[PDB]
Amino acid sequence: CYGDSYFIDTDLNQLKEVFSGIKNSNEQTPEEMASLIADLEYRYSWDCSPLSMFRRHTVYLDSYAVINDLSTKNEGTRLAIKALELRFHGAKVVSCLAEGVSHVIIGEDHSRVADFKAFRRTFKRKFKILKESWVTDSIDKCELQEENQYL
Amino acid sequence: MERKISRIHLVSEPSITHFLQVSWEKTLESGFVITLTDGHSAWTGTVSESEISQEADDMAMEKGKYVGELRKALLSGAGPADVYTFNFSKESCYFFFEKNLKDVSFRLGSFNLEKVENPAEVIRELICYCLDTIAENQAKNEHLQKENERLLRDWNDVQGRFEKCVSA
């Protein structure tokens, strides 16, 4: 239906022209697109790419003075840039502490580590405790460093 | 409670500096206390609301402008295009300040001061207040320096990471 053909291979220019042929497609939702992307990466073995390696992990941050309260934003800290960079590298930043959260980032403030540990124990699925240094040291390596050294 | 210390040169003795402190509760309109010292003896006087209002009415001009001129004269707020002359007589203990203008002098104010019975206490209090002022301002300056250094470092780091983000 588009420019691409079946019996002749494709090149960069041909694919660009075929893409320009399409008009638009916005019938999907963020969850469906994320699931499709993850399935494609798993199927075609594209997880080694520099980005999209945080897609499979949901990340929560201690950017609220009180856990699960949106009226106490702590904007104006390095945690904001850390969260934003993580999301840029494909991370799914979640603003609500749901049971499906698998990663939590904690900064220099260890006051609420006990609350996080208690919530992890309560939940059926446990999320490993991580520090903001791990992502900073991992970005330059473009790979997921072991969490044993930054639990 | 607000206080302001100023240096002045009396025309009676135009060779030594005399220091005048104005202390007012909230604003200069209600009133203030004037303490004028030369390092050996100090003279203290008070001005209340009634005398300021009476002088303004005698001044034949609005109260707001009178208080503005008073602040510009006593509180060291004088700009470039204005000259003030202070005259103090010790035998009568009479103070008064005027505004020189091209060989034309306006008698802005005339106060009466009473010699204190102990200048050491007042001089010590003045220098103590000023020392506290410096001690407190130094802390603010150093804290602001620390915060600015931290902000500069953080800004540099964020921009450096933005370069890589854009490149990718």
Curated annotation (Swiss-Prot), chain A:
Tissue specificity statement from the Swiss-Prot or TrEMBL entry: Testis, thymus, prostate and heart.
Protein name: DNA ligase 4
Subcellular location: Nucleus
Disease linkage: LIG4 syndrome: Characterized by immunodeficiency and developmental and growth delay. Patients display unusual facial features, microcephaly, growth and/or developmental delay, pancytopenia, and various skin abnormalities.
Subunit structure: Interacts with XRCC4; the LIG4-XRCC4 subcomplex has a 1:2 stoichiometry and XRCC4 is required for LIG4 stability. Component of the core long-range non-homologous end joining (NHEJ) complex (also named DNA-PK complex) composed of PRKDC, LIG4, XRCC4, XRCC6/Ku70, XRCC5/Ku86 and NHEJ1/XLF. Additional component of the NHEJ complex includes PAXX. Following autophosphorylation, PRKDC dissociates from DNA, leading to formation of the short-range NHEJ complex, composed of LIG4, XRCC4, XRCC6/Ku70, XRCC5/Ku86 and NHEJ1/XLF. Interacts with DCLRE1C; the interaction is direct. Interacts with APLF.
Family: Belongs to the ATP-dependent DNA ligase family.
Domain BRCT: 49-151
Effect of residue 15 to P: Found in a patient with microcephalic primordial dwarfism; uncertain significance
Entire protein: shown range: 760 to 910 of 911
Stated role: DNA ligase involved in DNA non-homologous end joining (NHEJ); required for double-strand break (DSB) repair and V(D)J recombination. Catalyzes the NHEJ ligation step of the broken DNA during DSB repair by resealing the DNA breaks after the gap filling is completed. Joins single-strand breaks in a double-stranded polydeoxynucleotide in an ATP-dependent reaction. LIG4 is mechanistically flexible: it can ligate nicks as well as compatible DNA overhangs alone, while in the presence of XRCC4, it can ligate ends with 2-nucleotides (nt) microhomology and 1-nt gaps.
Swiss-Prot record, chain B:
Tissues in which the UniProt entry reports expression: Widely expressed.
GO biological process: base-excision repair; cellular response to lithium ion; double-strand break repair; double-strand break repair via nonhomologous end joining; immunoglobulin V(D)J recombination; positive regulation of ligase activity; protein localization to site of double-strand break; response to X-ray
Chief localisation class: nucleus
Effect of residue 43 to R: In SSMED; impairs the protein function in DNA double-strand break repair
Oxidoreductase in keyword set: no
Result for mutant: residue 140 to R: No change in sumoylation
Residues found modified as Phosphoserine: 53
Modification after translation (UniProt): Phosphorylations by PRKDC at the C-terminus of XRCC4 and NHEJ1/XLF are highly redundant and regulate ability of the XRCC4-NHEJ1/XLF subcomplex to bridge DNA. Phosphorylation by PRKDC does not prevent interaction with NHEJ1/XLF but disrupts ability to bridge DNA and promotes detachment from DNA. Monoubiquitinated.
Substitution effect: residue 99 to E: Abolished interaction with NHEJ1/XLF. Abolished ability to bridge DNA. Abolished ability to bridge DNA
Domain of life assignment: Eukaryota
GO cellular component, one term: DNA ligase IV complex
Outcome following mutation: residue 161 to Q: In SSMED; no expression of the protein is observed; complete loss of function in DNA double-strand break repair
Record note on what altering residue 106 to E does: Abolished interaction with NHEJ1/XLF
Consequence recorded when altering residue 62 to R: Does not affect interaction with NHEJ1/XLF
Variant or mutagenesis effect after changing residue 82 to E: In SSMED; impaired ability to repair DNA double-strand breaks
Region feature Interaction with IFFO1, mapped onto this chain: 1-168
Disease annotated for this entry: Short stature, microcephaly, and endocrine dysfunction: A disease characterized by short stature and microcephaly apparent at birth, progressive postnatal growth failure, and endocrine dysfunction. In affected adults endocrine features include hypergonadotropic hypogonadism, multinodular goiter, and diabetes mellitus. Variable features observed in some patients are progressive ataxia, and lymphopenia or borderline leukopenia.
UniProt name for this protein: DNA repair protein XRCC4
Species per Swiss-Prot/TrEMBL record: Homo sapiens
